[PDB]
Write a protein that binds this DNA or RNA. Structure first.
Ligand code: CA
Ligand code: CA
Length: 757
DNA sequence: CGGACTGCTTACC
DNA sequence: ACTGGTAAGCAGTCCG
């Protein structure tokens, strides 16, 4: 299997490395045969020498076009011949481009921003993570003596924990008499050991939890301030601290640094993303968090260091088990997208999509359109019509069928050949005119995106067939990841169309996909209500909830199945309606907010404060019970009673504080904020004390007793002390518990005043 | 000024 | 930073 690619500068020339593992051994295949390239379009072909006259001033010597050649390519299908200007070293590519472009002879520059290492893998047609090879992994984690708003590295590392299949051990420089602890002389000695342990083990993968933005950055500052060759790489290299927008990433050249945080953060929805949280969320088992006030008092005292050690070890053990679970599927994405596990795991859907296109575009001899200019991005800042959302028939209904189109937007993109290279073509024999947007789509040649989207779905069925066959549960797991990911990559293409930063941006394409969506869902609802006696209780983009009011469950089901048999043949191309749920009873509140309970008793909840992570657990828990009380059981009184108890408990300060915690994400740079919420207020106060409240940070806080602004009474959850200051029973009554409960109970002719204690 | 409007902000579907 | 459509609350805005 191939791990990743980079290049070293062997005596002026660049040498491409292909880090791999085959025959149970790690190899480094070098390659000096590859040369950088970049496409240019001149107005008059003859004057290629005049353009080649353009040199570029670089920090290291001078640079000029090593060679050139006319390449017969295509651009949005329409053939286009271009000058492919080669270069001696790739670092000269970004120097001589702003000049080579600006030149009045050259029309435009194309494919100038693709990294050399990644470019090689695209052209050679090599696929990271292929073929069954067992990769050894090693998890590691650190415990530091943190104080309030110190400089990052000022505190020394007390412990370093590591974990793998065989064991989990702790390296520290204070006497802790436990079998899994290794006591060194000093902090410098603890690290010097940890570095041996890695080397002696020689693992392919290094697993961390937020290792990119903390653990690796911290160890460097320590190793720097102590004078240590922090050499973790197989080539004996120090870790690279490369930047990635608001955050950084960390490269261990020779090994795969797998940081779980960006994966976990982008895969599971949780209020907090503490390692203690995700372990419970993924595995079910609990995990104790030994805090900094504890860690410090232990170090300073020497008293309870055995407890601080159990934490250090667990942190690693957990970190390893999370890695061993998530790494498999992230490896399948490495193969699918065509770039490294390192890149893939740190990338957005926009990038993973764009990397998929660049690869399939090369194979197809399609010249990749450039990322948008600062001016261009603002030129394409115009929103469009989205999905249809029917205003719900509010109330408590019985016997609901839920119908929805199988993969709507991708089915529309393939069926109507919605591509940027099929949009308003010159003299196609056959054309598809989109309903409201009016944009015509050519039907003579399969479009670039539709074609690939076709192949993806084509393959997803090949993989789901090989699954039913595959006897090995290990293969049946790895096959499932492949097809589950393909489906996500498939439904991502419409969004990539509407994405201003995207290479293959197409406002017309996006607007037309949604436009058809509306045509079809509305025509189903119309047929379902007219041709058949159904009442559509609710709908949203591609699905609907319906019933025959008086009818029984058996009848609803039959007549619903009858409808599919009727409608589906009248629908065009890949568009096909599906029966995907029956519910004994259902409760629709507002657009986006509703709950159902199936024949077997499982309540499904959508939109309501229960599922929202910016609501106190008591409000959510309260709503959840005052919702079960009306659905699972038909006792509207029970809900009245439940609400009346949860109020008095809050009134008599008997509700545990943990349940009163309110989580809100800080989205942008704190200074940029216009208006101040309670969660911004807390962030601005913590910023004065030098807490790292950066974009992506979650503000956990409790509202304290008083009056005026809710934000000026807001303190961090960590810093709540029952003895010192109490909580605001008025807030968690009037602003949380009562509202969420009244949403459900308002339909049963109850007032808010009624439910209070 | 004690109410109703309106804009900012977050997280959901 | 993959989209648009939507609920809902905080904390200011207007106005008689
Ligand atoms: Ca549903
Ligand atoms: Ca579906």
């Amino acid at each position: 299997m191939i791990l990743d690619t980079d290049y070293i500068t062997e005596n002026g020339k660049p040498v491409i490395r292909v880090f791999k593992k085959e025959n149970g051994e790690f190899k480094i295949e070098y390659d000096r045969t590859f040369e950088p390239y970049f496409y240019a379009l001149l107005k008059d072909d003859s004057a290629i020498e005049d353009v080649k006259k353009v040199t570029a001033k670089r920090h290291g010597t001078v640079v000029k076009v090593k060679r050139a050649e006319k390449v017969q390519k295509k651009f949005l299908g329409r053939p286009i011949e271009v000058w492919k200007l080669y270069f001696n070293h790739p670092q000269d590519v970004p120097a001589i481009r702003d000049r080579i472009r600006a030149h009045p002879a050259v029309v435009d520059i194309y494919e100038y921003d693709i990294p050399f290492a990644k470019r090689y893998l695209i052209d050679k047609g090599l696929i990271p993570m292929e073929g069954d090879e067992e990769l050894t992994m090693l998890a590691f984690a650190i415990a530091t003596l943190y104080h309030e708003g110190e400089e990052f590295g000022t505190g020394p590392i007390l412990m370093i924990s590591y974990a793998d299949g065989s064991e989990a051990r702790v390296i520290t420089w204070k006497k802790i008499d436990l079998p899994y602890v290794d006591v060194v002389s000093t902090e410098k000695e603890m690290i010097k050991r940890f570095l041996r342990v890695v080397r002696e083990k020689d693992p392919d993968v290094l697993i961390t939890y937020n290792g990119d933005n903390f653990d690796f950055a911290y160890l460097k500052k320590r190793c720097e301030e102590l004078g240590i060759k922090f050499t973790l790489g197989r080539d004996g290299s120090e870790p690279k601290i490369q930047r990635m927008g608001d955050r950084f990433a960390v490269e261990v050249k020779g090994r795969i640094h797998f940081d779980l945080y960006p994966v976990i953060r982008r895969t599971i929805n949780l209020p907090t993303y503490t390692l203690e949280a995700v372990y419970e969320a993924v595995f079910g088992k609990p995990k104790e968090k030994v805090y900094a006030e504890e860690i410090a008092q232990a170090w300073e005292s020497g008293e309870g260091l055995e407890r601080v050690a159990r934490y250090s070890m667990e942190d690693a053990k957990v970190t390893y088990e999370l890695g061993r679970e998530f790494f498999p599927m992230e490896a399948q994405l490495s193969r699918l997208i065509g770039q490294s596990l390192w890149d893939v795991s740190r990338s957005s859907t926009g990038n993973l999509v764009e990397w998929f296109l660049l690869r399939k575009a090369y194979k197809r001899n399609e010249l990749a359109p450039n990322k948008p200019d600062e001016r261009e991005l603002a030129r394409r800042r115009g929103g469009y019509a989205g999905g249809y959302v029917k205003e719900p028939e509010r109330g408590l209904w019985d016997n609901i069928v839920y119908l929805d189109f199988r993969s709507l937007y991708p089915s529309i993109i393939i069926t109507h050949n919605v591509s940027p290279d099929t949009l308003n073509r010159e003299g196609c024999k056959e054309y598809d005119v989109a309903p409201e947007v009016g944009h015509k789509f050519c039907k003579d040649f399969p479009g670039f995106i539709p074609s690939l989207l076709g192949d993806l779905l084509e393959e997803r069925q090949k993989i789901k067939r090989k699954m039913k066959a595959t006897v090995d549960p290990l293969e049946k797991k790895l096959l499932d990841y492949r097809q589950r990911l393909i489906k996500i990559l498939a439904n991502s293409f419409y969004g990539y169309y509407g994405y201003a930063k995207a290479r293959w941006y197409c406002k017309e394409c996006a607007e037309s996909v949604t436009a058809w969506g509306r045509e079809y869902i509305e025509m189903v609802i119309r047929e379902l209500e007219e041709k058949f006696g159904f009442k559509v209780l609710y709908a949203d983009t591609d699905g609907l909830h319906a019933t025959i009011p008086g009818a029984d469950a058996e009848t609803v089901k039959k007549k619903a199945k009858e409808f599919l048999k009727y409608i589906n043949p009248k629908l065009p191309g890949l568009l096909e309606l599906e029966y995907e749920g029956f519910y004994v009873r259902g409760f629709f509140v507002t657009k986006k907010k509703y709950a159902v309970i199936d024949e077997e008793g499982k309540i499904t909840t959508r939109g309501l404060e229960i599922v929202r992570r910016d609501w106190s657990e008591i409000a959510k828990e309260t709503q959840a019970r005052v919702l079960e009380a009306i659905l699972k059981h038909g006792d509207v009184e029970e809900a009245v009673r439940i609400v009346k108890e949860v109020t008095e408990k809050l009134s008599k300060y008997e509700v545990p504080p943990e349940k009163l915690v309110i989580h809100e994400q800080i989205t942008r740079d704190l200074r940029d904020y216009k208006a101040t919420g309670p969660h911004v207020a807390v962030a601005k106060r913590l910023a004065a004390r030098g807490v790292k409240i950066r974009p992506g940070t979650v503000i956990s806080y409790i509202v304290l007793k008083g009056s005026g602004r809710i934000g000026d009474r807001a303190i961090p959850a960590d810093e709540f002390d029952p003895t010192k200051h109490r909580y605001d029973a008025e807030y968690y009554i009037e602003n949380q518990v009562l509202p969420a409960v009244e949403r459900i109970l308002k339909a049963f002719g109850y007032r808010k005043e009624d439910l209070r204690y």
